[PDB]
Amino acid sequence: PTHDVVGVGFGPANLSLAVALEESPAALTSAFFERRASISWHQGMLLPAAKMQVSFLKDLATFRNPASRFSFVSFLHERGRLVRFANNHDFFPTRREFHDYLEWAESKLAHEVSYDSEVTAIRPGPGRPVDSVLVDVSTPEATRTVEARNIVISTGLVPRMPAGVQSDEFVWHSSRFLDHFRDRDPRSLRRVAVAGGGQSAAEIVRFLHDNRPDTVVHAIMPSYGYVVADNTPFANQIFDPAAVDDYFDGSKQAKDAFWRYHRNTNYSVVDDEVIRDLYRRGYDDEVAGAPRLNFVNLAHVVGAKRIADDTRVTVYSMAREESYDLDVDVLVCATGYDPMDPGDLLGELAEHCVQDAEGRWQVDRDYRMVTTPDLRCGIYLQGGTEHTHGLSSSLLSNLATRSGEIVSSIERRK
Amino acid sequence: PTHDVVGVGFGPANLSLAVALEESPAALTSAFFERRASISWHQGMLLPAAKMQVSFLKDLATFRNPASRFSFVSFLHERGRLVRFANNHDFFPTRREFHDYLEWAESKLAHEVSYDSEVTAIRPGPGRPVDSVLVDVSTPEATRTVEARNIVISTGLVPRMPAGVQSDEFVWHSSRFLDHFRDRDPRSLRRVAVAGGGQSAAEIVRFLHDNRPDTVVHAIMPSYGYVVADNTPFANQIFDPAAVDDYFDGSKQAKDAFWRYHRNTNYSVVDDEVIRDLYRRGYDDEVAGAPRLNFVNLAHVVGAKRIADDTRVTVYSMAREESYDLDVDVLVCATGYDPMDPGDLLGELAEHCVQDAEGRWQVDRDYRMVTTPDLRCGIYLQGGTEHTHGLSSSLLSNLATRSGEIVSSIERRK
Amino acid sequence: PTHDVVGVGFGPANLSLAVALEESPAALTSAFFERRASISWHQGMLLPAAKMQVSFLKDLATFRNPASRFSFVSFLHERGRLVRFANNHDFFPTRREFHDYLEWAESKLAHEVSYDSEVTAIRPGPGRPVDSVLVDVSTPEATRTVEARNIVISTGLVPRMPAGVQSDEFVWHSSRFLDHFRDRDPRSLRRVAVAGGGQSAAEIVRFLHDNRPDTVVHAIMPSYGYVVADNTPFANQIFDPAAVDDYFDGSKQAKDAFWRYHRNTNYSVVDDEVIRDLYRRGYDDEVAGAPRLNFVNLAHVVGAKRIADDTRVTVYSMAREESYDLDVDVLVCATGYDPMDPGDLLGELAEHCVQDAEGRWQVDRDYRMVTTPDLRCGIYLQGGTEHTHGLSSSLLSNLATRSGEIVSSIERRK
Amino acid sequence: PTHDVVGVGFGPANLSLAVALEESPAALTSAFFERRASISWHQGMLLPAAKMQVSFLKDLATFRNPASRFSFVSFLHERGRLVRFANNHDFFPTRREFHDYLEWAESKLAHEVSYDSEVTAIRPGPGRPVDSVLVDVSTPEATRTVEARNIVISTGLVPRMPAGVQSDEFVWHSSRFLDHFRDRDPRSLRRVAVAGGGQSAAEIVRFLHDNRPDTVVHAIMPSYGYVVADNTPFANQIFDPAAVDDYFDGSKQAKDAFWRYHRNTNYSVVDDEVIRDLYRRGYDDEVAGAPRLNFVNLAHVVGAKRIADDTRVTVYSMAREESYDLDVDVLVCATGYDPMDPGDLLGELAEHCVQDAEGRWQVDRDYRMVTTPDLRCGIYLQGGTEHTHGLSSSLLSNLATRSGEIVSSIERRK
């Protein structure tokens, strides 16, 4: 049994793909494999006040199909919370509500996703030219192989630790913050260092500040203060379907300009509202004569070691061009992520995939990897297209159109 | 040929009815009559900056059917403006865009509306009990009569001038502001009086101030300054479908409480942003040493007379308890509207319509007039239900659910 | 030793008076008596997030003297927080910071206030015409009498409980909320009823929601939902110095118009941001499937009784026109305040104070009670002038100008 | 006659110096020379809606002296506009009002400024050690020389045109926009090109769009849309007095970090509000079917030539890597400014001024140029300290403290 398309991973990207498949009149067979027991959308960072960074209109389908049964609005309606939501006049749902939306959409699908199923490799199917791929799937009990004419890789961002710092029992990456934080006896995390100046760093500091009154927090970041995230309307355009065209067709000089001017729309920046809230907290503590937030600016974390009952963080100060130590109970590294790497699961098939001068996967407009004539199977990327398709690659801005484009591509080639 | 339902008037209310009819699986025949040449939704007040007072999610259908082909979101999509609109992050479209939406929805309808068709009377059909009504329709060429088992009256708010003031060539009601303003020579309206403290009054003054630099404006209103419109989420809940029930099923005492506390959600009030804009304009003029906005507070317009080339406005000052005369080129009365009244159109049928103690029409929860057993035809009201259904009656807050309940009622009784 | 002026009470109003006295070139002797141990400015309601309802520019002096050593700006500067405050771009300080400001201003004063000193009576001095008043002061150790040519009564708002509800250990007035709440066992206040729809009611509910995850709260109020406080620039003009004149010189009809239209600037209303925050909390709880905020609208508390371990609150529902019982651990009545009344303190002197038709004190523009020729001493009111001077009487909007006018009046008559 | 200090230029910077001198108890003689007829603070860009980029609290003196007779608040009070201003709740005055403030402050000043007086050179005074400088002043009638022990150079930003483009009758720099625009016939500027993506560019485009309904505008900028200006509280800390020290004492690495992360607080960026307003304008035009704003992104103006009745603008597109022409009536270059440079004015004294490795002027913390032993006179810079003191150098953020430090330095050396 050969599937038209197999999806690796089941986060929002492949979920929108599943939705696109179901709404398409094309009869395409599919299977999706997710390593986790269920949809798990950055749960480590599902903090109490966390808000979506995108508008609810930017959901799984609406931009493609304004009357989708899978729209966020449909979700609200079924949950009897559309009227209440509209009264709030906030375009940005909470992360918690959105996570619910995902699970609701997944349930509504006719198709059934295979959970607890980790794709370990993707191999050339039999014959030349290669007309199918073999997908090696590991479940807790067994292992098996499924065959597919096309494959869509959507395995998500990859946590990035500072150079020279390894995650450990008292050194956490932000992605696994709540995982670790639930364990730990409250009276044992009185001193926390948080590395980073981005959205993750800010949210974690805010959470620590609100959730227990006596925690002392060291916010260590290279900038002089949080840099504001740019969500102004002209800016939000870089995420419009048509802007993806602009970026794709543009010269390397144009692509650079994109990053040079508009990297602030997403990377190493903090939403305006979160910034103000942190500032208000700092101000009120000063008034109360009880400072707890220590902003260590123009600095990086360059090392961590456990010494007795204290995690010793080595900080490099740019202002003084000197390193020094910082003893705390826990170091949380909110130091960001690396892009999805298409090459991960590809071994041999990577031989048939085409790189450019600088070594990067070549990708067609329809998110399909460029291959030699030895490969006729479609390898599509949702994620890992930062170089070719732009800033929207890892984000939720363009789920509907990207998924739709991929489905159409697959139908066209069938 | 007897129709299941005939709609009198084709503003947003009956348009949502037409949509509800089309989306309903029930096979109901219908005709709609509009006296104008086309949909004309308060065009006299389609000022440059005018913004909807209701969220785009409150459209013709979405609250009833979250995936309607007639949703505002569908409209944006077809116009290729959904992405752009979402980037704006504003829940409130312009009046101009919304007017487009209505025309777009009307065109989509399978059914064809009869324009240039004024309903002049509604009369008892033949027989007893009365099982149909006769609808007298006047077109430019002819007159005719069509028969219907149910009728839905939605003829809109009725302009209300101040007592003792009649509309005239230099005394206008706000509803016909642009109609009269586009005609006049700019250099002839250097002095304008605007009566009222509501949304209409404020928008007109703002428009006059922005449009031409030398117009002097007298803003005459009973309050000491504009009163802010309440659109905070809890007060807004009075427009929830469920709040209609609360109002309907509530005692007279409870109904009175709605008006006493929440009349400021709509009547005699001005949107926060419009108020601030006017204030900024006044401030900047003062700085420039060139005042043009004269706020005449705690006052009422009590008369107008044309004297040579001047419109003389008689103003009563509450502070002073005396009247005085104000000479301008034009008096614009933004003094509001009276509710729809099915009274005039009904004639003989009114005999079979039951009134309450205070002589008002009794109306069922499904918007259907209470009748004697002599009358079995449904007379539904969209508008004119302020006293039975509450503050949502004349507004856009509840189009989807009201229209849906009327359609269901008609189907149930068939 | 006869003082030119004696101040009864030392809240913000008399503090601004003290400041006005010191800044005036006039050499006037004074004494101030405060019953409490120190300045105590609604400490029972000093909740964590509470924000001033008035701009920092509306402080003790700035409107009168734009370069006062007692300005809020001077306070920030001395505290080394001015730059930090300006960066925040918020016109509204916290209540906690403002309380600090008051104490700071009090300390800076040359004059020394007499604390722990309750004024128990004000009596006619010796002679005719009565030329001085005698002020009976009770300290913890002794009692004494001081003599003054003028007296300024500023004893503040008086807590008002719902009719037929008396405060006790499980039935609190909002004014003493933190007094009772602190140290009460957390696990013993799992069910709280809060009566009222005003700023106090809203802040307490929000605090309860924020500070304890388990607490179930019943918000009981006569309106259908919180009514927004009007702070828009034009309505806010009623607090301008010149608007005091407009109100004072205006007819009874005009005065009524102020209250009819602009009572929503202060009474029985809630700040926009606090409303939205409560709504967001309610929404998120619904999403989480854990409702805790119960809004009991169109209702009022009509009785309370202690029954075993429960406080039984009798609620009257306007919608149903019936009464029912609600069991909670504590009833907090945030039911507002009555105006200051010089009546009690005055005794005999009241004979020489002229009343108008409705039993109310006549007051001159300069806040000086109207007296018979039998009395030449100045009795000034800061507070209790709602009926003569308007909505600014109990508020912080006009401290600088009122205090300045009182000082000037006293100097003029000397 | 030898002055303690001579100021070159009389914009806000030297105005604050004059104020600092006055308020200082030190008896220092001074003269100020301005080449214009009066204070002329970027009048070419005094557009109708233009708003200060800095809080009113950041005025001539307040941060140094919180009760200055020259504060913005004092200004408002004297103008009888303090109450009205506070009611507006806007920290940011209009540029128009601020310009008034400057003139008002100038008039208050006890000592008189010499207008129509252009400093043409600064020379070594006679003898050894060099204890004075000679200032060559050219008035319309005569020329003269004044002597001073110290000199403060504050001659402002210098307009910068694109490379290969020269200002002309139909090619304007933004700084002279209104100067040229008030002259031209309206019907002759139907096609305008505006180069730049900064605050100047945005304001001019907005003005052109609002002013006349039929102007077509080409907005040419290197970014893919306007980049938001960062004004959030933490990033704004870079303008704190203490942040000057951090920048000054910091390594080159640290200084680079300030620019790398926080350049977006001021350069090549646009205020949030202005961006949103432009976007709304674009949206409404599309709805109206009448587009007029053409955003030419990822592009640079590289040339301009007059050809008959057309200004032909050569545009380089980074996306296509090619150049093309656009014909308009006028090209406005809003392409920014170069820093103040004491270089030109200094001449021979420059020999006595020490440069660093990269050939830049070495400046002490007090703003005083580093000199050779023979030179004992103080040469202070207000402006032109970007490389030593940081991003505050050309701005209004720090007038009070900088001026105060310079005055103190002069007194201390005296």
Ligand SMILES: Cc1cc2c(cc1C)N(C[C@H](O)[C@H](O)[C@H](O)COP(=O)(O)OP(=O)(O)OC[C@H]1O[C@@H](n3cnc4c(N)ncnc43)[C@H](O)[C@@H]1O)c1[nH]c(=O)[nH]c(=O)c1N2
């Ligand atoms: C805390 C936080 C919050 C947000 C965001 C990031 C972070 C860290 N993002 C960006 C983020 O990339 C986005 O929200 C989604 O996670 C992207 O969807 P994906 O399906 O592509 O990755 P995603 O990570 O969601 O899905 C990957 C899945 O594949 C599974 N998987 C990986 N390898 C596998 C294998 N070998 N076999 C089987 N399964 C495998 C993983 O288990 C995982 O479930 C965002 N962006 C935005 O625009 N707005 C927003 O609000 C947010 N919110």
Ligand SMILES: Cc1cc2c(cc1C)N(C[C@H](O)[C@H](O)[C@H](O)COP(=O)(O)OP(=O)(O)OC[C@H]1O[C@@H](n3cnc4c(N)ncnc43)[C@H](O)[C@@H]1O)c1[nH]c(=O)[nH]c(=O)c1N2
């Ligand atoms: C300037 C302005 C702006 C707004 C609003 C009012 C005003 C004055 N409204 C309220 C307004 O009532 C609502 O928007 C609709 O007009 C109501 O729809 P009807 O369909 O009920 O009115 P209208 O929309 O008033 O429908 C009546 C129509 O029937 C026609 N008609 C009358 N008599 C007839 C006859 N005898 N025969 C045939 N046709 C006849 C009329 O010609 C008219 O077209 C509003 N509310 C809100 O909630 N949000 C908002 O943004 C606005 N905007």
Ligand SMILES: Cc1cc2c(cc1C)N(C[C@H](O)[C@H](O)[C@H](O)COP(=O)(O)OP(=O)(O)OC[C@H]1O[C@@H](n3cnc4c(N)ncnc43)[C@H](O)[C@@H]1O)c1[nH]c(=O)[nH]c(=O)c1N2
């Ligand atoms: C929780 C809360 C918060 C606010 C406000 C009210 C409340 C309840 N207000 C209004 C409030 O009225 C105002 O802030 C001041 O309290 C009024 O000053 P007095 O100085 O007039 O009152 P208070 O400030 O009430 O002055 C009274 C003092 O006199 C003392 N006293 C009474 N009788 C005495 C006696 N016989 N002998 C000696 N001393 C006696 C009392 O002890 C007390 O210290 C307000 N308004 C606004 O415009 N903005 C705001 O932010 C707020 N904030």
Ligand SMILES: Cc1cc2c(cc1C)N(C[C@H](O)[C@H](O)[C@H](O)COP(=O)(O)OP(=O)(O)OC[C@H]1O[C@@H](n3cnc4c(N)ncnc43)[C@H](O)[C@@H]1O)c1[nH]c(=O)[nH]c(=O)c1N2
């Ligand atoms: C349109 C616009 C608007 C703003 C700003 C810039 C621009 C272009 N700025 C920055 C701007 O640099 C600042 O507002 C002041 O102009 C700087 O003060 P200066 O006194 O140093 O220069 P400024 O240019 O104001 O004054 C210099 C003066 O010296 C005179 N002069 C020059 N050479 C001379 C000579 N040889 N002899 C005699 N006189 C001579 C000139 O005539 C001129 O009047 C700003 N920044 C901010 O933080 N907030 C804001 O709101 C603004 N607003």
Ligand SMILES: NC(=O)c1ccc[n+]([C@@H]2O[C@H](COP(=O)([O-])OP(=O)(O)OC[C@H]3O[C@@H](n4cnc5c(N)ncnc54)[C@H](OP(=O)(O)O)[C@@H]3O)[C@@H](O)[C@H]2O)c1
């Ligand atoms: N509420 C939400 O929906 C939410 C929450 C969290 C994250 N997200 C999303 O997830 C994505 C990533 O955000 P992110 O904050 O996790 O990552 P991020 O944007 O890459 O931010 C990483 C930060 O850590 C800094 N850093 C790197 N090495 C460091 C070191 N050795 N010491 C100190 N700081 C160091 C980076 O500084 P430099 O770049 O200057 O080197 C940067 O400030 C974004 O798309 C974001 O929007 C969303």
Ligand SMILES: NC(=O)c1ccc[n+]([C@@H]2O[C@H](COP(=O)([O-])OP(=O)(O)OC[C@H]3O[C@@H](n4cnc5c(N)ncnc54)[C@H](OP(=O)(O)O)[C@@H]3O)[C@@H](O)[C@H]2O)c1
């Ligand atoms: N942008 C939009 O979508 C828009 C624009 C305009 C209107 N509308 C809507 O249309 C409806 C009507 O609003 P409206 O502003 O036209 O009317 P309105 O709300 O009824 O207000 C009428 C005003 O005139 C005053 N008034 C009455 N008699 C007067 C007199 N003799 N002299 C001076 N003033 C007098 C009223 O004062 P009192 O009430 O105190 O007596 C009131 O302030 C509302 O639903 C509104 O939201 C919407």
Ligand SMILES: NC(=O)c1ccc[n+]([C@@H]2O[C@H](COP(=O)([O-])OP(=O)(O)OC[C@H]3O[C@@H](n4cnc5c(N)ncnc54)[C@H](OP(=O)(O)O)[C@@H]3O)[C@@H](O)[C@H]2O)c1
């Ligand atoms: N309302 C106000 O108070 C107000 C008004 C206007 C200005 N200002 C102030 O004045 C100062 C300067 O602002 P500004 O906007 O005048 O200048 P600016 O910040 O320097 O911005 C100049 C812009 O022109 C661009 N540019 C450079 N060469 C170009 C070319 N050949 N073709 C097209 N575009 C080109 C720059 O792009 P790149 O830099 O990316 O190369 C940049 O976006 C700031 O302090 C600003 O805040 C204040």
Ligand SMILES: [Br-]
């Ligand atoms: Br968005």
Ligand SMILES: [Br-]
């Ligand atoms: Br719903």
Ligand SMILES: [Br-]
């Ligand atoms: Br690193």
Ligand SMILES: [Br-]
């Ligand atoms: Br560890």
Ligand SMILES: [Br-]
């Ligand atoms: Br970890």
Ligand SMILES: [Br-]
């Ligand atoms: Br949190």
Ligand SMILES: [Br-]
């Ligand atoms: Br492009």
Ligand SMILES: [Br-]
């Ligand atoms: Br540290």
Ligand SMILES: [Br-]
């Ligand atoms: Br796409």
